[PDB]
């Protein structure tokens, strides 16, 4: 049916009652879930899933993914390794061919820059501009929200950049990474097969996240860092959940992934 | 100090759970029944945990199992794989792309399929045959083997069907092998959906690898049990397979078998991981 | 509730303590060296403990060892027995008077010796011989076996020297034989019989120990002594100790000693004491 | 020969310059005349060196490990007997019926203060001895003024404690003489039958009466007080030095010449 929607489930018991997929609470109140309408269900800590609920999810082709609170990380996935071979080989073919791989890489940079960028530059030149763009975007957000900024922490040995803002950015980015991986898994792709970022277990997750990172997630980190909280990680995770609830961020993940890969000009499976 | 999964070789092959809720209580993986009794299961020392219907699963249980590299397999009636959870996928792209390169190139694919043929039947296939021809030849031998076994154990045979007593024993026995094989492929870092003989299916590569060693260990036992016609066939089949897996060292053989099959494409395989080995335990003191 | 000694066959045959003091600290049998280090020894799982010169023993250690049926053996030059302590005598008078009756009557005694002779040499003794005559014949067989082992192991032989005042091979034999004598005495005591009442050997405190041990010493213990003397290594005694411990375990000597004692005495055809 | 027996307690035992020395808790040293003593009874708290054990073996002095005041015999040197000639001598007497009877009558002769008439059967001697043993207890009860109902109450507890000390030193004496505690004549069938035999002969001299003396005072802890009293008795009243000669005299009843 080609669905793109993703939802969270938390602090409840899950079972199929009268043929219906429902989330029951501690009081006994039960919420109904449109499983056949969603592509992926993200199970947060505190959830308990019955054998019948798992069976129904498999039947309707809705991927079950077990994540941390607010999708801070992905612990486990239903159908590990991948259930959709047509999507994996599609992703693999794009990575195996140098020409197709270049088209995907350049498309990723176009989406990051926000412009078609028709000028023929090398990949190294493209990385340099991005490095400057990210640095500027970080400083711009600090200028916008009035946050003291000494640079992004890229080294755990760099204690000086271990401030409140860098901790909020790390927490927010973690939530984005989790829901991004789940979206990749739901689309039937492999998180480790990346294009711009390579050689890491979550390389493809980074590629997708780096495109939409500064849209809503990272700005929210600066917003929370503005008013110094006692427990930054907690409030950031909550705010990210509210973004995943209010905004259509989760619904845009899968089409973004497909659009990126479609730049290889190879016909996607159907 | 990182938590590293141990080799499947050093584990119990499989454990079937039929009731209750698996969870992690007080830092221990347990099976909790309706009365509150918890049964400790050293999850890291189990290769496959099968979940029969009526079994509920908690978030902490699924998390811990994936962290320790223990595949959870949801099983229906009877023995049939319904679902499975584990680490999202292969952590190494070079391994995934290596497997995909072999499966996408028709020349490389045929070379792999031939090795699978030779390993399964102990002899090379006829020369210059396509994949679909090897499939026909394979199917001919399989029907003959089924018939040959049915006469040795003295069981009525009308062919293999996937939907009486013998066919239920075979499927239940093969399902044990499939679960264990899926775990070996995941532990190796490959994709169980990318196959060579079987294609397009979520577990194509599992069927590919398992069918190679299927008749040597698992299948003839299903006939030995079917002739006796026990009260609970599928349960007796499961225990039999566990004995065979242990006796034949199945777990230990799977990963090298997988690599050997893929190596037949004559493409240089990705380098093995750098082994960081735990130092030996301090020796006793003399003159004590 | 009561404390019962476990069978000798279920224990480490022998342990040799060279220095320090043995005692019972906080309900545990321990060895204490000069520096204060305590080493726990499960006394009840040892058949006999050998105490070398420079070793001290406490009252509590001697007591506990006797209660658990572990023979304490004081050792001198080349492992020679200087002394031993344990539970006094045999608790059952029927077993003592049985053994004594067999030894005091010359006809019954003669029925015991040939049994010893037959078990030792694997063949009946020549008929109608006295104990003295059998002793001479046995001695002749012994010298022959000694010479055969010498040629076999390439060890130069000049005769058997029981006194250290008279070499390398004779030292290995005495050290090996002392090991067997130690566990044999323990077996005899554990069976309830008197080590002083012998049939071939007489008059000595360990006459019955010598009788029983000499039957099986050439089977395993003595030839290994020749094997050690062939290498001519440093610490010849210590290497013989370990070799005898392995021999005792692999041959299950402590298990075989009990029936050997019983069969030897049964040869007199007097009804044995009733078990247990 | 030598028939003396001594107690050693609370100290290190070693050999210096060829001398047998006991070193107390405090630095005080005591030289023990081994070679002139038949047996050394080691009490709790004693620690013996290898050299001391060796010296005792050379001079022929038996080391016996006992509880306080010889309450019990835990272990003995040369277990299973050291002297076969003595052991076989005792055995021979018990084997021949005619010989053991001579030992039995001699024992009853010693329990009495006079030779028993020849017509008396062994069964009658037991009946006579039993009556005068019972009469002895009653006489002792009247003397010390204690409530007596037969051989539990405080008095029986004191008697048991007193005899147990004597039983220990008697066993050690039997061992020192190279005999077997289990081979009895009047009393048979028990591991300490011969011990009971010899001890019953002399227990009413100082040991048992002392139990009545202490029981009269009605102590809270009768066992410890009795043991200490027996300790003083063994220390001053030369009862220890008379054990071995008694044992030899009893067995001498058999017409067979001693070893």
């Amino acid at each position: 049916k080609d669905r793109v929607s993703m939802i969270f489930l938390q602090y409840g018991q899950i079972d199929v009652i009268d043929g219906a997929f429902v989330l029951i609470d501690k009081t006994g109140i039960r919420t109904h879930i449109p499983v056949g309408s969603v592509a992926c269900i993200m199970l947060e800590p505190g959830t308990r899933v019955s054998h019948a609920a798992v069976r129904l999810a498999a039947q309707v082709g809705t991927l079950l993914v077990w994540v941390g609170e607010a999708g801070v990380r992905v612990y486990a996935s239903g159908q590990p390794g991948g259930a959709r071979s047509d999507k994996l080989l599609y992703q693999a073919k794009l990575a195996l061919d140098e020409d197709l791989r270049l088209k995907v890489v350049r498309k990723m940079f176009e989406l990051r820059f926000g412009e078609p960028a028709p000028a023929r530059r090398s990949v190294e030149q493209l990385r340099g501009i991005e490095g400057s763009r990210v640095r500027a975007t970080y400083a711009l957000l600090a200028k916008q929200y009035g946050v003291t900024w000494n640079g992004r922490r890229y080294d755990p040995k760099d204690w000086e950049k271990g401030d409140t803002i860098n901790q909020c950015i790390s927490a927010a980015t973690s939530c984005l990474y989790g829901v991004t991986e789940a979206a990749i898994l739901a689309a039937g792709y492999a998180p480790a097969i990346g294009f711009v970022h390579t050689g890491k277990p979550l390389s493809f997750v980074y590629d997708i996240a780096d495109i939409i990172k500064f849209d809503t997630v990272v700005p929210k980190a600066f917003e929370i860092a503005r008013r110094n909280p006692g427990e930054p990680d907690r409030e950031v995770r909550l705010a990210c959940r509210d973004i995943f609830r209010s905004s259509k961020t989760l619904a845009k993940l899968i089409p973004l992934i497909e659009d990126v890969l479609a730049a290889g000009e190879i016909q996607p499976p159907a | 100090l990182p938590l590293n999964p141990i080799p499947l070789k050093d584990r119990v092959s499989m454990i079937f759970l039929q009731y209750g809720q698996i969870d992690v209580i007080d830092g221990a993986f347990v099976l909790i029944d309706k009365t509150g009794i918890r049964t400790h299961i050293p999850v890291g020392s189990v290769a496959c945990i099968m979940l029969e219907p009526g079994t509920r699963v908690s978030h902490a249980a699924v998390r811990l199992a994936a962290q320790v590299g223990t595949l959870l397999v949801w099983v229906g009636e009877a023995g049939v794989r319904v679902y499975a959870s584990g680490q999202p996928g292969g952590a190494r792209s070079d391994k995934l792309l290596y497997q995909a390169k072999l499966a996408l190139d028709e020349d490389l694919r045929l070379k792999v399929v031939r090795k699978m043929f030779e390993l399964r039947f102990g002899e090379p296939a006829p020369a210059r045959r396509s994949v679909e021809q090897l499939r026909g030849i394979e199917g001919s031998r399989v029907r003959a083997t089924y018939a040959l076994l049915a006469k040795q154990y003295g069981v009525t045979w009308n062919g293999r069907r996937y939907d009486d007593t013998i066919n239920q024993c075979i499927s239940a026995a093969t399902s044990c092998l499939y679960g264990v094989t899926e775990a070996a492929i995941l532990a190796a870092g490959y994709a169980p959906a990318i196959g060579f003989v079987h294609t397009g299916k979520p577990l194509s590569f599992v069927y590919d690898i398992a069918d190679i060693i299927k008749f040597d260990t698992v299948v003839p036992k299903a006939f030995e049990i079917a002739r006796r016609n026990p009260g609970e066939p599928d349960r007796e089949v499961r225990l039999a397979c566990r004995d065979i897996f242990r006796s034949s060292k199945t777990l230990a053989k799977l990963i090298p078998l997988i690599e050997d099959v893929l190596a037949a494409g004559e493409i240089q395989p990705p380098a093995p991981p750098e082994d960081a080995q735990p130092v030996a335990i301090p020796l006793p003191v003399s003159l004590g | 509730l009561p404390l019962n000694p476990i069978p000798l066959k279920d224990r480490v045959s022998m342990i040799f303590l060279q220095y320090g003091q043995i005692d019972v600290i906080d309900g545990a049998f321990v060895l204490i060296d000069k520096t204060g280090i305590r080493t726990h020894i499960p006394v009840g799982s040892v058949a006999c403990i050998m105490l070398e010169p420079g070793t001290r023993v406490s009252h509590a250690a001697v007591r506990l060892a006797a209660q658990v049926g572990t023979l304490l053996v004081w050792v001198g030059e080349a492992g020679v027995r200087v002394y031993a302590s344990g539970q006094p005598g045999g608790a059952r008078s029927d077993k003592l008077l049985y053994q004594a009756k067999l030894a005091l009557d010359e006809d019954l005694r003669l029925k015991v010796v040939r049994k010893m002779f037959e078990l030792r040499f694997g063949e009946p003794a020549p008929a109608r011989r006295s104990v003295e005559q059998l002793r001479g014949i046995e001695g002749s067989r012994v010298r022959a076996t000694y010479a055969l082992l010498a040629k076999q192991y390439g060890v130069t032989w000049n005769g058997r020297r029981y006194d250290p005042k008279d070499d390398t091979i004779n030292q290995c034999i005495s050290a090996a034989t002392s090991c067997l004598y130690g566990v044999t005495e323990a077996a005899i005591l554990a069976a309830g019989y008197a080590p002083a009442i012998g049939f071939v050997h007489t008059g000595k405190p360990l006459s019955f120990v010598y009788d029983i041990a000499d039957i099986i010493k050439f089977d395993t213990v003595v030839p290994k002594a020749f094997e050690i003397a062939r290498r001519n290594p440093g610490e010849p005694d210590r290497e013989v100790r370990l070799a005898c411990r392995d021999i005792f375990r692999s041959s299950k000597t402590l298990a075989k000693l009990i029936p050997l004692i019983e069969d030897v005495l049964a040869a007199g055809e007097i009804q044995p004491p009733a078990p247990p | 020969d030598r028939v003396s027996m001594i107690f050693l307690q609370y100290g290190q035992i070693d050999v210096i310059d060829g001398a047998f020395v006991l070193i107390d808790k405090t630095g005080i040293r005591t030289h023990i005349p081994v070679g002139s003593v038949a047996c050394i009874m080691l009490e709790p708290g004693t620690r013996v060196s290898h050299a001391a054990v060796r010296l005792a073996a050379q001079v022929g002095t038996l080391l016996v490990w006992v509880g306080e005041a010889g309450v019990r015999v835990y272990a003995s040197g040369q277990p299973g007997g050291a002297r076969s000639d003595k052991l076989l001598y005792q055995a021979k007497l018990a084997l021949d019926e005619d010989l053991r009877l001579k030992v039995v009558r001699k024992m009853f002769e010693l329990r009495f203060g006079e030779p028993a008439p020849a017509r008396r059967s062994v069964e009658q001697l037991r009946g006579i001895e039993g009556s005068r043993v019972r009469a002895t207890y009653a006489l002792l009860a009247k003397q010390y003024g204690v409530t007596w109902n037969g051989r539990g109450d405080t008095i029986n507890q004191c008697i048991s404690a007193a005899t147990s000390c004597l039983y220990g030193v008697t066993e050690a004496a039997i061992l020192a003489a190279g005999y077997a505690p289990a081979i009895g004549f009047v009393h048979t069938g028990k591991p300490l039958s011969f011990v009971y035999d010899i001890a019953d002969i002399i227990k009413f001299d100082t040991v048992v009466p002392k139990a009545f003396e202490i029981a009269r005072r009605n102590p809270g802890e009768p066992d410890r007080e009795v043991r200490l009293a027996c300790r003083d008795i063994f220390r001053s009243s030369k009862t220890l030095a008379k054990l071995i000669p008694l044992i030899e005299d009893v067995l001498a009843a058999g017409e067979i010449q001693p070893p």
Partner: protein
Amino acid sequence: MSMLVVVTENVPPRLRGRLAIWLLEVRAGVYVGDVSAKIREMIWEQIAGLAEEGNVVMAWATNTETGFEFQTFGLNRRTPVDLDGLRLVSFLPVGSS
């Protein structure tokens, strides 16, 4: 003969003394040896008789599929259970649910 391990908790000095007679005390309350089934059964009798309100677990090596067997004694002891020929352990919660 097989490896035997005995772990005691809050047992009287009586039991600890008896175990130290036959088994090696590698830690206070932890005893290990290599003994026969007959001796092991004797050890358990010593445990069942001398332990009182104390916790004891005894484990030994077997040729079974799990490779070991165990039995418990005393306060809040855990229960040895069998799952399809595999030796596991079951126990009650500490006030949970």
